[PDB]
Amino acid sequence: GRSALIVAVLCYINLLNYMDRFTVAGVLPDIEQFFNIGDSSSGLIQTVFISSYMVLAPVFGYLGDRYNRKYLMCGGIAFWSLVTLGSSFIPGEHFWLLLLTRGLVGVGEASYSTIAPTLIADLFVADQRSRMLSIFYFAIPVGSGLGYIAGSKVKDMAGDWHWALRVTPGLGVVAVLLLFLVVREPPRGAVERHSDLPPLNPTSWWADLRALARNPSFVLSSLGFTAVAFVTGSLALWAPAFLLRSRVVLGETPSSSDSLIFGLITCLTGVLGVGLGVEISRRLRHSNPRADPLVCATGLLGSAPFLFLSLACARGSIVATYIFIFIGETLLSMNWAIVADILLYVVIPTRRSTAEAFQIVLSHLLGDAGSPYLIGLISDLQFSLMLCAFVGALGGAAFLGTAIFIEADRRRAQLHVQGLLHE
Ligand SMILES: CCCCCCCC/C=C\CCCCCCCC(=O)OC[C@@H](O)COP(=O)(O)OCC[N+](C)(C)C
């Protein structure tokens, strides 16, 4: 009864998190005009954000494995909300202030995104964990899309680009108050372990890193998740320009309507993919214990041919291409929630924050330092799509390799929880 309200609070804070991530991307051309900057500086904003995020994710993993998770989350939320509200007041003489404030936003969001799913892990069990993680990753893409559209509409109505950063910090003191009042910090593995036992002690951090590098299920699911994130990021970067150029060749248009249509499509396939993936994995898991990574691999390698045929279909019509991309993105998007589950049952509750931090670092590094840096390098159009398909096939092989090792690793972790094995 109280854990449902905790899940509602965490879903709301996740929606706010991605809203604050994308509210500056929904206002980008007026930023490019205000500070007198070219094309590279928007990529510099996003690069500073993701770099601070990746560098400060391991620190908050190490802190959330050993200290009060609710206090660190409250501090992170208060920090990024305060620095956003302060970043609203930057004059046009200094752009590096905007860069530094984006870095601090990245720090706070790294804190929250590293620590938050461990509470959902420690409050529920298998199927209910799967459904509440489904709600969490329902909250991410609606948050991103609504943040873009809210920044854009607030800038259009108010007339100043600064007001795009003034909408989100007002909904941040509410999240801090809710996280202080409603959420109560659960023990590390309260439902995976009886209450009469002494609490589990966190060992050294080097032992945590060696133990997280010695199990193959977690590493291979992280590599599959990395490949999926790379494929989706490159596709979202490439698709609107491709559809515009297709309508240029046909002659319909000699970036607003197609952009909003593709944004609606991305949001709807995100929520439908998370829902369908959790549903199929929960259905199949009872008759097959290795069904989560198999469903991940089926989603990835069954999304591959729909996108592969959309390029051939785009010459004839547009509606069939839209439909086929809508069908492929769902199978691309099951993997978020299913990979979050696969992480949260193969890792000891004294290592889940470090596992989330390592997964964040690996995924964001090999996806976002690679796609806008190598896709644009090899593009300047079919070899980029062939590289995308090769990475997708490698991710499918990684998810099958996860399916080989998921039983032994889940058993070893659940026996380590019960104290029957000692490291
Ligand atoms: C039981 C229910 C209890 C409470 C219910 C509340 C739950 C959540 C509340 C409200 C959300 C509903 C509104 C629908 C959201 C749809 C999002 C939406 O329509 O977004 C508009 C699109 O334009 C966003 O996509 P873009 O940002 O363009 O794509 C990115 C392009 N890029 C180049 C910048 C990378």
Side-chain angles (χ1 to χ4, degrees):
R2 277 84 54 192
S3 314
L5 205 62
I6 291 183
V7 167
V9 166
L10 294 194
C11 162
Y12 165 66
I13 299 169
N14 212 6
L15 186 140
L16 175 75
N17 175 21
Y18 276 81
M19 183 184 295
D20 211 344
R21 196 164 305 190
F22 272 82
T23 178
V24 69
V27 78
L28 215 50
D30 298 79
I31 291 184
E32 298 193 289
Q33 176 273 349
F34 197 61
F35 297 109
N36 201 350
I37 53 190
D39 197 328
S40 45
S41 293
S42 316
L44 199 56
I45 286 182
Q46 185 62 267
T47 300
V48 165
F49 173 81
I50 303 180
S51 291
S52 282
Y53 189 81
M54 290 188 323
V55 172
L56 269 300
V59 187
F60 284 108
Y62 173 64
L63 292 190
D65 274 329
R66 291 149 170 78
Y67 303 98
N68 214 352
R69 302 202 297 272
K70 150 171 164 175
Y71 269 46
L72 302 169
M73 285 202 293
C74 276
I77 297 160
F79 192 66
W80 83 69
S81 278
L82 278 165
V83 304
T84 313
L85 174 63
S87 158
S88 161
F89 296 101
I90 303 176
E93 271 196 290
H94 319 114
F95 175 62
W96 62 84
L97 266 296
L98 178 60
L99 290 181
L100 199 148
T101 52
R102 291 329 280 178
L104 306 187
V105 170
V107 168
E109 298 192 11
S111 156
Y112 179 76
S113 315
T114 308
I115 295 175
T118 71
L119 280 76
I120 304 189
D122 302 359
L123 286 183
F124 302 91
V125 286
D127 292 18
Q128 218 161 26
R129 282 184 291 176
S130 183
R131 189 168 306 264
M132 302 310 165
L133 291 161
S134 157
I135 292 170
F136 205 72
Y137 292 90
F138 274 9
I140 68 164
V142 179
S144 66
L146 200 153
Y148 183 95
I149 202 165
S152 180
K153 290 291 200 306
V154 166
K155 187 222 80 180
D156 281 358
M157 269 176 137
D160 208 286
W161 79 265
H162 299 118
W163 286 91
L165 305 176
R166 267 170 213 183
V167 55
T168 182
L171 298 151
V173 308
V174 168
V176 171
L177 285 174
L178 283 193
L179 209 63
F180 259 115
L181 299 201
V182 176
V183 161
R184 307 149 202 96
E185 163 84 6
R188 261 158 191 89
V191 297
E192 291 99 2
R193 181 197 40 83
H194 39 57
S195 297
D196 57 356
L197 213 54
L200 197 42
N201 54 329
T203 174
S204 316
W205 196 53
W206 188 226
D208 281 16
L209 285 190
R210 212 202 171 197
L212 280 184
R214 279 181 319 199
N215 63 331
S217 156
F218 159 74
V219 180
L220 283 165
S221 90
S222 282
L223 293 178
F225 174 77
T226 289
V228 164
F230 174 82
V231 166
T232 63
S234 165
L235 165 63
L237 190 148
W238 161 76
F242 171 74
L243 282 151
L244 289 172
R245 183 228 39 83
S246 159
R247 293 200 329 278
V248 167
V249 161
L250 173 145
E252 165 93 354
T253 291
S255 198
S256 277
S257 171
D258 207 292
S259 179
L260 63 94
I261 287 164
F262 196 83
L264 280 170
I265 280 181
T266 292
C267 181
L268 287 194
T269 67
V271 300
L272 180 57
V274 174
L276 281 180
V278 167
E279 216 165 319
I280 299 180
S281 158
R282 162 194 68 95
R283 275 187 166 135
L284 285 193
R285 188 194 288 159
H286 301 294
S287 291
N288 197 12
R290 41 177 73 162
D292 308 84
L294 286 182
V295 163
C296 272
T298 299
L300 182 53
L301 294 190
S303 52
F306 277 104
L307 314 177
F308 215 77
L309 172 138
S310 90
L311 168 141
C313 171
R315 200 269 318 175
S317 159
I318 171 176
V319 175
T321 299
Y322 280 159
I323 284 181
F324 293 156
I325 294 169
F326 160 81
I327 294 177
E329 281 258 342
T330 314
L331 318 169
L332 271 178
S333 310
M334 301 148 41
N335 308 318
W336 325 126
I338 304 185
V339 160
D341 206 338
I342 291 170
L343 185 141
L344 286 179
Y345 63 76
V346 307
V347 191
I348 317 188
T350 78
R351 277 157 194 169
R352 276 166 187 172
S353 280
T354 307
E356 293 269 2
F358 173 84
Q359 203 179 52
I360 278 179
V361 165
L362 194 53
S363 157
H364 280 287
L365 182 55
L366 292 184
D368 295 19
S371 36
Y373 282 92
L374 279 296
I375 296 313
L377 171 83
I378 198 162
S379 191
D380 311 329
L381 292 192
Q382 69 84 58
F383 206 104
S384 158
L385 189 66
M386 182 203 317
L387 171 65
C388 203
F390 165 70
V391 170
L394 192 149
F399 276 123
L400 301 182
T402 305
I404 305 173
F405 295 103
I406 190 77
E407 293 215 46
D409 282 312
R410 179 179 195 169
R411 162 171 56 211
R412 165 196 313 149
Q414 76 190 341
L415 282 194
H416 204 127
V417 173
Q418 301 274 320
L420 304 177
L421 320 174
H422 283 57
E423 171 162 352

